């Protein structure tokens, strides 16, 4: 409990590590701002080494030294009373090559990754003739893939009845051992609600979700 890194401190009390493999002034707990899980929410995703590079002094290291090699640990926790209910799905997929709305085009950069701001899913299709937009129908998970099969990646269940938090540890997964961090996002974090949030009247109408990221062994 109450681990420390640099000048930040997060308190805790399970863990799931990578594919069985265990992975200096930047090693601090960067914490993105929280999203609000409502009743009829859809899902969120962040591209991983882009949401950091816009903001912190880790991003100040990014413009100086482009090419690097990193390893991540990810804390995800949401806080609610006993009286709510629902079930999330935290999965850290590598090399998420999403598909465009229009069939002949490719999605542009501004839709592909909100820098430290969560892009959202939806539960319908999208129109195609407009511009470069990501095909963001949730029940094919954006990749043309059946969503129920997504647990082949390192995943972790959050079930509001018993469990409350989630921790992920992801080692460096790439073909070439050194690449530029501007044109290649190796990891992708997803949060999908399967059993939707429900509550009776008088409770709070939303459950906030915080995600806390920390790099480990960042070389350049």
């Amino acid at each position, epitope marked *: 409990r109450s681990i420390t890194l640099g000048n930040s401190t997060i308190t805790t009390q399970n863990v799931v590590v990578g594919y069985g493999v265990w992975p200096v002034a930047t090693c601090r707990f960067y914490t993105l701002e929280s999203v609000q899980w409502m009743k009829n929410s859809a899902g969120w995703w962040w591209k991983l080494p882009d949401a950091l590079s816009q903001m912190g002094l880790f991003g100040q290291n990014m413009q100086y030294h482009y090419l690097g090699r990193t390893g991540y640990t990810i804390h995800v926790q949401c806080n609610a009373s006993k009286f709510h209910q629902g079930c999330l799905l935290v999965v850290c997929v590598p090399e998420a090559e999403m598909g465009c709305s229009n069939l002949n085009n490719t999605p542009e950069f501004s839709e592909l990754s909100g820098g430290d*701001s969560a892009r959202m899913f*939806t539960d319908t299709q999208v129109g195609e003739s407009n511009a470069k937009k990501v095909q963001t129908a949730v029940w094919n998970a954006g990749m043309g893939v059946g969503v129920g099969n997504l647990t082949i990646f390192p995943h972790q269940w959050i079930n509001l009845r018993t469990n409350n938090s989630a921790t992920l540890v992801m080692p460096y997964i790439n073909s070439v051992p050194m690449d530029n961090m501007f044109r290649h996002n190796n990891l992708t974090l997803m949060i999908i609600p399967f059993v939707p949030l429900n509550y009776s009247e008088g409770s709070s109408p939303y459950v906030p979700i915080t995600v806390t990221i920390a790099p480990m062994c960042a070389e350049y």
Partner: antibody
Amino acid sequence: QVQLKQSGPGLVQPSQSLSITCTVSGFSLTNYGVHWVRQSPGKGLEWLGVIWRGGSTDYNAAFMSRLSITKDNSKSQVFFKMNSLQADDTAIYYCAKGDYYGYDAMDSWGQGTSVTVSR
Amino acid sequence: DIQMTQSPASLSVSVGETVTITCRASENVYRNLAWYQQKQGKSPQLLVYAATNLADGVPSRFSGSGSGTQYSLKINSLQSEDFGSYFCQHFWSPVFTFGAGTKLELK
């Protein structure tokens, strides 16, 4: 959070050009796209055009040549130029933000600027 | 092109009944519908997006249903402020079109 506001001419001359500057607040421009929607008493509601959050633009079919919508990121202002300003454009004009939780729907709007064309 | 037909034109009911309103499209929209309400001399506001998902500030009295082309909205109990206009709008593809616009006298 304070929403967006706007300011227009209010009175023009017929067969001219127009410029409304809509000022946003509370949100960035890389996450939301603004919508230009004309509320009219005669034709009702009608949508003109959208610049997306990536800078690419869209237009209505019947207004392909007389519009030019653009924005700035840091100054957080959007500009669009209605042109040729004919006698059927006597309507109030709205600035409105989009992308309500990623759904392409108008979340909040401006205050509305009423314009007329004639003397 | 895609068109929306709002029906009926206008209603005049008392306060507190279960009233309904529909609008039909021309082709499929895949539930990409948004309903709007504007009173006299103000901006419109969004109530239901994606034809069933209600907004944040809207009460639970409003509900919308439908799939494909036939879509509808339901107000189970009207109040004093529940008059004003009502508009439905698709957002499938540019060009986005709107509905006609209904009105409530609340006699």
